[PDB]
Design a protein around this ligand. Structure first.
Ligand SMILES: Nc1nc2c(ncn2[C@@H]2O[C@H](COP(=O)(O)OP(=O)(O)OP(O)(O)=S)[C@@H](O)[C@H]2O)c(=O)[nH]1
Ligand SMILES: [Mg+2]
Length: 315
């Protein structure tokens, strides 16, 4: 049969990454020609990230560790143009490498909640040696890690357990929220994504607004929307990996001042689950099927999607 899945959630919550996983898990994964297409995206994400860290150092008044980096930073901008076209010269690679290793660069990297930085920055920057290689071809994980804002409506098709899925993805930034209603017809289930690690961040499109509060407002409106009464609500509390590392050092009280639990994964995670599940105004009549995920982890997504499928089949 025909199963219509709609991916919803604020910006950078992991929706497009789940879409990519369906291809890796239910199809062949990305072909060589397809991976080479993402080469420019990986290079562009890497360059953007190091530049965002360097922009930040000036704004925050953080000095380089070794004075010599000033020359590397200057050379960065000179050579950056190539990376956008899909080229990574040894010279530019070396420049980014030394900058990334610098103590002040790292100090600023560790204050990223104070500015805007891609989640994949470290992933690409720590793997710079591999991605800068001659004839580099993006791996499945590199593809999964890429970031490109979704404007418009993306539709994907795949067969799974005898069902023909038609998955829809739309942009979550505020400018894109208006396009959501175009997707509202015949939805079998909604997979609402939430970036767990967004609790200490603020909106790219607004400094005054905490990203998790924004996500709760969206969920509240989607979960309780009459149009969606007979649609299954599946909640993916995503980026559980980043959340696991982040909860150790950044207080959850930044997001929920009344949080009284410890700075540990299990306690904090269940607290957030309840915060969202409690927005359901009809607990007795409507169920929310919550799952903790790491969208970039194929094994995790596979087992979770498999469980999600059976729930769609049964209920
Ligand atoms: N480490 C980590 N990063 C993740 C996870 N799921 C998604 N990402 C990353 O976060 C970035 C944003 O995810 P993406 O899938 O683009 O979000 P989106 O909801 O589609 O964002 P938009 O199109 O509305 S602006 C990407 O670099 C992607 O790799 C996860 O669980 N762990
Ligand atoms: Mg997207």
């Amino acid at each position: 049969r025909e199963v219509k899945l709609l991916l919803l959630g604020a910006g950078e919550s992991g929706k497009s990454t789940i879409v990519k996983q369906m291809k890796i898990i239910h199809e062949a994964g990305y072909s060589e020609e397809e991976c080479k297409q993402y080469k420019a995206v990986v290079y562009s994400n890497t360059i953007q990230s190091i530049i965002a860290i360097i922009r930040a150092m000036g704004r925050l008044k953080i000095d380089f560790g070794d004075a010599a980096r000033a020359d590397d930073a200057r050379q960065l901008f000179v050579l950056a143009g190539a990376a956008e076209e899909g080229f990574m010269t040894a010279e530019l690679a070396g420049v980014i490498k030394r900058l990334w290793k610098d103590s002040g660069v790292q100090a600023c990297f560790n204050r990223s909640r104070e500015y805007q930085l891609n989640d994949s920055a470290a992933y690409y920057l720590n793997d710079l040696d591999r991605i800068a290689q001659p004839n580099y071809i993006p791996t499945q994980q590199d593809v999964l890690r890429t970031r490109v804002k979704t404007t418009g409506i993306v539709e994907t098709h795949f067969t799974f357990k005898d069902l023909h899925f038609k998955m829809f993805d739309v942009g979550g930034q505020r400018s894109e929220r208006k396009k959501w209603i175009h997707c509202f017809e015949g939805v079998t289930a909604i997979i609402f994504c939430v970036a767990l690690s967004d609790y200490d961040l603020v909106l790219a499109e607004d400094e005054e607004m905490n990203r998790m509060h924004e996500s709760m407002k969206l969920f509240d409106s989607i979960c309780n929307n009459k149009w969606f009464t007979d649609t299954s609500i599946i909640l993916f509390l995503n980026k559980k990996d980043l959340f696991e590392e982040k909860i150790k050092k950044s207080p959850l009280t930044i997001c929920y001042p009344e949080y009284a639990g410890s700075n540990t994964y299990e306690e904090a995670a269940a607290y957030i689950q309840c915060q969202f599940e409690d927005l359901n105004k009809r607990k007795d009549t409507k169920e929310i099927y919550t799952h903790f995920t790491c969208s970039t982890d194929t094994k995790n997504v596979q087992f979770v999607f498999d469980a999600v499928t059976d729930v769609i089949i049964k209920n």
